[PDB]
Swiss-Prot record, chain C:
Belongs to the Nup84/Nup107 nucleoporin family. This is Nucleoporin NUP84. It is found in: Nucleus, Nuclear pore complex; Nucleus membrane. Component of the nuclear pore complex (NPC). NPC constitutes the exclusive means of nucleocytoplasmic transport. NPCs allow the passive diffusion of ions and small molecules and the active, nuclear transport receptor-mediated bidirectional transport of macromolecules such as proteins, RNAs, ribonucleoparticles (RNPs), and ribosomal subunits across the nuclear envelope. Due to its 8-fold rotational symmetry, all subunits are present with 8 copies or multiples thereof. Present with 8580 molecules/cell in log phase SD medium.
Length: 231, 385, 145
C-alpha cells in the first residue's frame, strides 16, 4: 500500500517490528508502483527489490523504446544506478552484468549481421553444407519488410559459426572444462585436434602441429591441466 | 577547422579514391579523387559499444566498399555514397565498420550491426602499437608494430564476402633470450610501401626495416605462410660501393626509405653520406637490382646529387623517395625521373643508365623547386604519373 | 590559470549566499517567478563551475604529469561540497512552494554524483556520505505526500 501511496518514510521507520516480513516483500519480482517504484528502492538502501524490478522494465516497449533519445537515456540511467550499489545488498554481481549488457547486445548484433549477408559458411560435409538449405530460408523471411519474428532470429544466430569465435571454445574447456567431466572435454578437444592433424599429414609441411600446441601455452592452457595438445 | 590531436595519422587511399586523416577520437574522410576542389566531410565518432584491450594507438585506414558497389579504382565525381568500409584498431581488436552514413546521433544500437570484431594475438615481449597501415588490397591489410611484429589480416573470407580472418604473422615475436628486436628481423618498420599489383589476388609489398634488412613479401589474400622473396642486408654493400667514385663517403650511413622504380625488380634506396670536410650531406640515389629468381643482388649505379648538398631531414616522418608507378600511358619508360621529397625543397633528378666514363656517373641535369616550412607530411599515396 | 581554478569554489559560494537569503523569501513571501529566476541562476552557476574546473585541470598538462594528485585532492573537496550544498536546496523549495519540478531537480543531482569526472561517486562512498545523500532524495518525494 505504502509503496503506491508515496509513504516511504512510514515503510521503514514507523513499523520497525514487521521487518522480517519486509525482507519477503523485497524478494517480489516487482512491488507494484510502476517504473517509479524501482527508483525508490535504489534510494532506500533496499537494492535487492529493484534488481528484480528492472528485469520487467527491459521487456516493456513503453518504458524503453518510447523514442531513440529517451531509450539511450534509460540505458544510461540503469547503468549509473548500478554504480550506487553499496554493501547493504550485495548486488555488486548484478552491477557487473548491467555494464556487461551493452557489450552483450553488440556481440549479438555482430554475429547477426554476418549471417544476414551470408555470413554463415558452407558446411564442410561435401560440396555444400545442408545447414545452408535452412540458413537461406531464415535470412529471406527476415529480409522481407514484415513483422519481427522472434524464433527466426534465435535459430539463425547459432547454426553456422564464425571462425573469429573458434578460439573461445578451446580457452573455456581448459579453464572450466574439468567441471563438465574429463570425458566430455576430451571428446570436444579431440574433435578439433582431428581436423588439425588431418591437414599436416595430408601434405609434408607440419608446422600445423606446434601452432595449436604452443598456442595453448600463451594463455597457459596446460597449466589449467588435463588439456592435451594436438595428437 | 576540426579539433586537433597531437597525433595525426593519415593515409591517402587511391585504391578507392578517398582521403583520410584520423584522430584518436574521430576519423575525417573525404572524396579526394573529386573533380571539384570542395568536398563534403564525413565525421565518424568512436564507439563505446566496442571493446578494446592493450596499448595500441588508433590508426584508421579505408578499405574497399562492401555495402556499396566496389571500387578497384580511384573513383567518383563527388558522391559520398561509395565511401568504403573502415578499419580502426582499438587495442587487440581490429574493428571493421560497414556503413558509416546511416550512423544516427540519437541511436547507437544500429552501429552494432556494422561492427565486426576480431581478437589479434596477445603476448608480446617488446610490446605492440599500430605504426603504419598500408592498404595492399587486393590481398588485405598489412600493419606494422614498432617492435617489428608484422600482421597480415584478410578482410574477405573465401566466399568473397566480408569477414576478418587473421591470415598469418609475417614476422612472429622472438621470445629467444635477451633480444626481442635487438637481433632479429623484427625492428622498427621504417617503410611500408606497396609494390606492384601483379593481379591474381597478389600484391608485392616491400618491407624495409631500420637495421637495413630488405624483405620482399609476396602476399596473397589466402595464405597460412606468405613466401619471402628477398631477405638480404644491404647496409654493408652500400657503404662499400660508395668508395669507388666518392672519397668522402667515409662514415655515416643511413637508410631512410625504399621505393619501387618503373622496373619492378629495381628498387631505389635513399641514402646519405656525410662529408666531414665541410659538414655536408649528399643524398645518394642508389638503383639496386634484386634477383628474386636466385635471391641475389647487384648495385647498378650510385649517383651523387651535385648541386644539392643540403642536409634537409623531414619535419614529419623520415626522408622519403617517391617514384609513382605507371598506371596510364606515357611515352618512353627508359629514363626515370625521381622525386626526393623533403618539406623545404623538392629535388627533381634523373640518374644514370648510360655507364659513361666520359661524363662520369653523375653531373647530369639537376633542378630544385624550393618550398617553405609549412609542408607537414601526414601521409602519402600514388597511382598514375 | 591558477586564479581560474581557485575562483570556481568561491563563485559558487557567492551565489549560494545570495540563495540563503532567497530561502527566507520562499513560501510565497516574495512572488514566485523572481524566486525561481534566482534559483535557476544559483543551480546552474555551481554545476557550471564544477564542469569548468574539470576541463581546465585535465587539459593544462596537469593530468599528463604526476603532480595531478594535489589537484585531485582539491577536486575531492569541491565536488561533494558543492553537490551537497545544491542538493539540500530544492528539497526546501519543494515543500515550501509545493511544485514537483523541485522534487525532480533534487533527484536530478544524483545523476551528477554517478558520472565520472574523477569518479565522484567513489568520493562520496569514501567519505561515508553516499547513503546520507541517497536518503535525502527519497524524502523529497514524500513532500508531495
Amino acid at each position: 500500500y505504502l509503496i503506491k501511496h508515496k509513504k516511504l518514510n512510514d515503510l521503514i521507520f514507523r513499523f520497525p517490528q514487521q521487518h522480517d516480513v519486509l525482507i519477503q516483500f523485497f524478494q517480489e519480482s516487482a512491488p507494484k508502483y510502476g517504473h517509479v517504484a524501482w527508483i525508490q528502492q535504489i534510494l532506500d538502501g533496499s537494492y535487492a527489490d529493484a534488481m528484480n524490478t528492472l528485469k520487467n522494465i527491459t521487456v516493456d516497449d513503453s518504458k524503453k523504446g518510447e523514442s531513440l533519445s529517451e531509450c539511450e537515456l534509460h540505458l544510461n540511467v540503469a547503468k549509473l544506478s548500478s554504480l550506487l550499489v553499496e554493501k547493504d545488498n550485495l548486488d555488486i554481481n548484478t552491477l557487473r552484468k548491467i555494464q556487461y549488457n551493452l557489450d552483450t547486445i553488440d556481440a549479438e548484433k555482430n554475429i547477426s549481421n554476418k549471417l544476414k549477408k551470408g555470413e554463415v559458411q558452407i558446411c564442410k560435409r561435401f560440396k555444400n553444407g545442408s545447414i545452408r538449405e535452412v540458413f537461406n530460408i531464415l535470412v529471406e523471411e527476415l529480409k522481407s519488410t514484415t513483422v519481427v519474428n522472434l524464433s527466426d532470429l534465435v535459430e539463425l544466430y547459432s547454426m553456422l559459426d564464425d571462425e573469429e569465435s573458434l578460439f573461445i571454445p578451446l580457452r573455456l574447456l581448459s579453464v572450466d572444462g574439468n567441471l563438465l567431466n574429463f570425458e566430455v572435454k576430451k571428446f570436444l578437444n579431440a574433435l578439433v585436434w582431428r581436423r588439425i592433424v588431418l591437414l599436416n599429414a595430408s601434405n609434408e609441411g607440419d608446422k600445423l602441429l606446434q601452432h595449436i600446441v604452443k598456442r595453448v601455452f600463451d594463455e597457459e592452457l596446460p597449466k589449467n591441466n588435463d588439456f592435451p595438445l594436438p595428437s | 577547422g576540426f579539433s586537433n590531436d597531437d597525433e595525426l595519422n593519415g593515409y591517402i587511399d587511391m585504391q578507392i579514391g578517398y582521403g583520410l586523416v584520423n584522430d584518436h577520437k574521430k576519423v575525417y574522410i573525404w572524396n579526394i579523387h573529386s573533380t571539384q576542389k570542395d568536398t563534403p566531410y564525413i565525421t565518424v565518432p568512436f564507439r563505446s559499444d566496442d571493446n578494446d584491450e592493450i596499448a595500441v594507438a588508433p590508426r584508421c585506414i579505408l578499405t574497399f566498399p562492401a555495402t556499396m558497389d566496389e571500387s578497384p579504382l580511384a573513383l567518383n565525381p563527388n558522391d559520398q555514397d561509395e565511401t568504403g568500409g573502415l578499419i580502426i584498431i582499438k587495442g587487440s581488436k581490429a574493428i571493421y565498420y560497414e556503413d558509416i552514413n546511416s550512423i544516427n546521433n540519437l541511436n547507437f544500437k544500429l552501429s552494432e550491426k556494422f561492427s565486426h570484431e576480431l581478437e589479434l594475438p596477445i603476448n608480446s615481449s617488446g610490446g605492440e602499437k599500430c605504426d603504419l597501415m598500408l592498404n595492399c588490397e587486393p590481398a588485405g591489410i598489412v600493419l606494422s608494430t614498432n617492435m617489428g611484429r608484422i600482421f597480415f589480416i584478410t578482410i574477405r573470407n573465401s566466399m568473397g564476402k566480408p569477414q576478418l580472418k587473421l591470415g598469418k604473422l609475417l614476422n612472429k615475436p622472438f621470445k629467444l633470450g635477451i633480444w626481442s628486436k635487438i637481433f632479429n628481423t623484427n625492428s622498427s618498420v621504417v617503410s611500408l610501401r606497396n609494390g606492384p599489383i601483379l593481379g591474381k589476388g597478389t600484391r608485392l609489398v616491400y618491407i624495409t626495416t631500420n637495421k637495413g634488412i630488405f624483405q620482399t613479401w609476396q602476399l596473397s589474400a589466402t595464405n597460412s605462410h606468405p613466401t619471402k622473396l628477398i631477405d638480404v642486408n644491404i647496409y654493408e654493400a652500400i657503404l662499400e660501393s660508395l668508395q669507388d667514385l666518392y672519397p668522402f663517403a667515409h662514415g655515416t650511413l643511413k637508410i631512410w626509405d625504399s621505393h619501387p622504380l618503373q622496373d619492378e625488380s629495381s628498387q631505389l634506396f635513399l641514402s646519405s653520406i656525410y662529408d666531414s670536410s665541410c659538414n655536408e650531406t649528399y643524398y645518394i640515389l642508389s638503383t639496386i637490382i634484386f634477383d628474386s629468381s636466385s635471391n641475389s643482388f647487384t648495385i647498378f649505379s650510385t649517383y651523387r646529387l651535385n648541386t644539392f648538398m643540403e642536409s634537409i631531414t623531414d619535419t614529419k616522418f623520415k626522408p622519403k623517395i617517391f617514384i609513382p608507378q605507371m598506371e596510364n600511358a606515357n611515352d618512353t619508360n627508359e629514363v626515370t625521373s625521381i622525386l626526393v621529397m623533403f618539406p623545404n625543397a623538392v629535388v627533381i633528378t634523373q640518374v644514370n643508365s648510360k655507364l659513361d666514363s666520359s661524363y662520369s656517373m653523375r653531373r647530369k641535369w639537376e633542378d630544385i623547386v624550393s618550398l617553405r616550412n609549412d609542408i607537414d607530411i601526414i601521409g602519402s599515396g600514388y597511382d598514375s604519373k | 590559470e591558477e586564479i581560474t581554478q581557485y575562483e570556481h569554489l568561491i563563485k559558487g559560494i557567492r551565489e549560494y549566499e545570495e540563495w540563503q537569503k532567497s530561502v527566507s523569501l520562499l513560501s510565497s513571501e516574495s512572488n514566485i517567478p523572481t524566486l525561481i529566476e534566482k534559483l535557476q541562476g544559483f543551480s546552474k552557476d555551481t554545476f557550471e563551475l564544477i564542469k569548468t574546473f574539470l576541463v581546465d585541470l585535465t587539459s593544462s598538462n596537469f593530468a599528463d604529469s604526476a603532480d595531478y594528485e594535489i589537484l585531485y585532492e582539491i577536486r575531492a573537496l569541491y565536488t561533494p561540497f558543492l553537490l551537497m550544498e545544491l542538493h539540500k536546496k530544492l528539497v526546501e523549495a519543494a515543500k515550501l512552494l509545493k511544485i514537483p519540478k523541485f522534487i525532480s531537480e533534487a533527484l536530478a543531482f544524483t545523476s551528477l554524483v554517478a558520472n565520472e569526472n574523477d569518479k565522484i561517486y567513489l568520493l562520496f562512498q569514501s567519505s561515508g556520505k553516499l547513503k546520507e545523500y541517497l536518503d535525502l532524495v527519497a524524502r523529497t518525494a514524500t513532500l508531495s505526500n
